[PDB]
Amino acid sequence: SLKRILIVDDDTAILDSTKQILEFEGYEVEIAATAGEGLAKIENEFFNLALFDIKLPDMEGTELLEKAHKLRPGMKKIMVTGYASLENSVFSLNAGADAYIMKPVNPRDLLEKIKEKLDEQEKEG
Amino acid sequence: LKRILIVDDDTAILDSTKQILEFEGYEVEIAATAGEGLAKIENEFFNLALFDIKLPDMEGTELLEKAHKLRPGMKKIMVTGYASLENSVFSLNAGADAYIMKPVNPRDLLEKIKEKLDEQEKEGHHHHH
Ligand code: NA
Ligand code: NA
Ligand code: NA
Ligand code: NA
């Protein structure tokens, strides 16, 4: 029933605030503070959509994306980063990201982008 | 056969890339401006299009947006010598399927095209069943 979203960011403050916003909107949410943790969850649990930070402690969020997209091509993936670059944006595009947002992002904009991608997912089947 | 449109005002790039793609068995059409590109997209079927960004009549990112409205199912790969954070982020958000910085390695281009066309086939299967 409920749409399920994974948030991956080593900033636990961002995890907390983002989870609260998403849960209040009515989503079921899981959080992860490292790329390895995110990947383990993606392997074992279903998600409609994931939000990925890029500058993660244990590996670049772009590597996380690449693996996640191989595992779950149908899942939507939005990069959300305060470390945007030409290199990591081009990589994110090639690796399967569906959207790319630069921090700080406000709650309304984040929810609107998520809804848009979840709608597109439904129309795709 | 799979059909590809190449849009770039650099006619030497058009010609060389057409040659390479035809050798691989693709049917290819070419366009030297965004307008010509959009006119062809409106009037004939393509599986996939390659878009330059610095075109003379409009930016390749605008072309991408318009092309996506005309043919959302068509795959789109940006191929540019003028990559920037701004236009790569825009292309990602606007629905581009891949993005290649010149100078282009044909093996890389051919691999990305094949990957995107395989994905298109899987997508079509899903839409259908
Ligand atoms: Na980080
Ligand atoms: Na997808
Ligand atoms: Na994409
Ligand atoms: Na050009």
Q: What is the 3-state secondary structure (H, E, C) of A22-80?
A: HHHHCCEEEEECCHHHHHHHHHHCCCCEEEECCECCCCEHHHHHHHHHHHCCCCEEEEE
What is the CATH T-level fold of the domain A1-125, as seen in this structure? Rossmann fold (3.40.50)
Query: What gap in Å lies between CA A98 and CA B96, rounded to an integer?
Result: 9
Furthest-apart CA atoms within chain B: distance in Å: 43
* Burial of A5 from C-beta contacts in 10 A (0-12 / 13-18 / 19+): buried
At a CB cut-off of 8 Å and minimum separation 6, what does A124 contact?
Answer: A74, B123, B126, B127
Ligand approaching nearest to the C-alpha of B51: 4
The domain limits of chain B are 1-129
Residues of B with CB under 8 A from a CB of A: 83-85, 88-89, 91-93, 96, 98-99, 101, 112, 119, 122-123, 126-127
**Cα-flanking dihedrals φ and ψ of residue A106, to 5°?**
-85, 160
Chain A positions in Cβ-Cβ contact with residue B127 (cut-off 8 Å) = 124-125
**Region for residue B74 given its phi and psi (left: phi exceeds 0; alpha: psi -120 to 50; beta: otherwise):** beta
Query: What gap in Å lies between CA A53 and CA A104, rounded to an integer?
Result: 12
Query: What gap in Å lies between CA B61 and CA B12, rounded to an integer?
Result: 22
Pairing of strands B98-101, B75-80: parallel
Query: What gap in Å lies between CA A11 and CA B4, rounded to an integer?
Result: 44
Query: What gap in Å lies between CA B76 and CA B2, rounded to an integer?
Result: 14
Place of tokens 């068995």: B25
At a CB cut-off of 8 Å and minimum separation 6, what does B5 contact?
Answer: B28, B29, B30, B31, B37, B40, B41, B46, B48, B49, B50
**Cα-flanking dihedrals φ and ψ of residue A2, to 5°?**
-60, 140
Architecture of domain B1-129: 3-Layer(aba) Sandwich (3.40)
The one-character DSSP state at B59 is: B
Place of tokens 């909107």: A25
Closest CA to A25 of A107, A124, A118: A107
* Ion ligand 1: residues, Cβ under 5 Å: A 10, 53, 55
Interface test with B, best of A89, A92, A100 (most B CBs within 10 A): A89
Query: What gap in Å lies between CA A77 and CA A62, rounded to an integer?
Result: 11
